[PDB]
Design a protein around this ligand. Structure first.
Ligand SMILES: Oc1ccc(-c2ccccn2)cc1
Ligand SMILES: [Mg+2]
Lengths: 150, 152
C-alpha cells in the first residue's frame, strides 16, 4: 500500500545514511517519535519539517556545521527538527566508554517509547536506544530488523 | 506588518546570514528564489526537501563534498523546495570568462524565468546575483539585502 511503500522508503533512506556515517565515523543522533509525543524536544531544535532523504540526513550531521550538534527528531515520516536537545540518562549501566550522544539517546528512551539510532564518532559503531536500554554494535541487518519491528 | 510580511523578513534574514557565512569561507553556493514563473520542472530534477528555511539548513546544504552541495537549491516562498537541482547553462557572452558552471547556471535560469539567483564564488568568495539574463557581481552585504527586499 501507499502507507507501506512510504515506510519502507523511509527505512531505506535511514539505513543508507547510517551506513555512510558509520563508515566515516560521523557522530549522529536520530530519534524517531512513536506514540509518546516529543513536541517539547522538537521545539528546542531548528525547525525543518522536511522530506526524508539519505542525502539530507547525511548533510545534517557533517561535523563542524550548524546542524550537527544535537538530535534529529523524525515525526510522521518527516524530519521535524535538527540540533534538538535530549535529556541525558543518569543510568549507571551504560558502557563507561560512551559519551553524551549515547547518554542522550538512552535518556530520551527512558521517558518515551521512541527509537533512537546513534553512530559513534569514535568507532563508527551503530547502536539503538529503546525503553532505557542501549543495543550496541549492530549490523546493518540488525538495525533494519529493529526499524521494521518498530 | 502582516504575517506574510514578517515571514518574508525572516526568510530574507536567513538567506543573507547563510550567504554571508559561505562567502567568508569560500563555500560555493547556488540559490534560486522562484518568483512568478513556476520552476517545477527544475525543482523535480533535485532531491526534494520541502523544508522550512533556516540559515543553518542553507549552510549545511552547501558544505563541500556532501550529497547535497552540487547543483542549485530552489526556494519557493518560505521553503527550500529541493537541493542539487539542475539549471540550464547560459551561453551569454557577458559572463566573465573566468567564472564556472554555478554562474552560468544562474544566468541560464534567469533567462527563462523571473527568478532571482544568488551565487557565492568558491574561488573569491564574491557574491553575485542573476536576474533577467544579467549577472551583477561583487555585491556588498547591504546591496544583496536591498535586492532581496526589493524582490519581495
Ligand atoms: O570527522 C569528519 C567526518 C566527515 C567529514 C566530512 C566532510 C565532508 C563530507 C563528508 N565528511 C569531515 C570530518
Ligand atoms: Mg561592481
Amino acid at each position: 500500500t501507499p502507507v507501506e511503500e512510504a515506510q519502507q522508503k523511509t527505512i531505506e533512506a535511514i539505513t543508507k545514511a547510517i551506513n555512510y556515517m558509520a563508515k566515516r565515523r560521523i557522530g549522529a543522533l536520530l530519534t524517531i517519535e512513536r506514540d509518546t509525543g516529543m513536541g517539547d524536544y522538537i521545539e528546542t531544535g531548528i525547525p525543518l519539517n522536511a522530506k526524508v532523504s539519505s542525502e539530507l540526513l547525511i548533510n545534517i550531521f557533517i561535523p563542524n556545521t550548524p546542524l550537527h550538534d544535537g538530535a534529529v527528531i523524525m515525526k510522521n515520516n518527516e524530519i521535524a527538527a535538527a540540533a534538538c536537545y535530549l535529556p541525558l540518562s543518569e543510568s549507571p549501566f551504560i558502557s563507561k566508554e560512551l559519551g553524551t550522544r549515547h547518554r542522550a539517546a538512552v535518556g530520551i528512551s527512558e521517558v518515551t517509547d521512541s527509537l533512537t539510532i546513534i553512530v559513534s564518532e569514535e568507532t563508527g559503531g551503530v547502536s539503538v536506544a529503546k525503553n532505557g536500554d542501549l543495543h550496541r554494535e549492530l549490523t546493518e541487518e540488525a538495525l533494519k530488523e529493529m526499524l521494521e519491528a518498530e
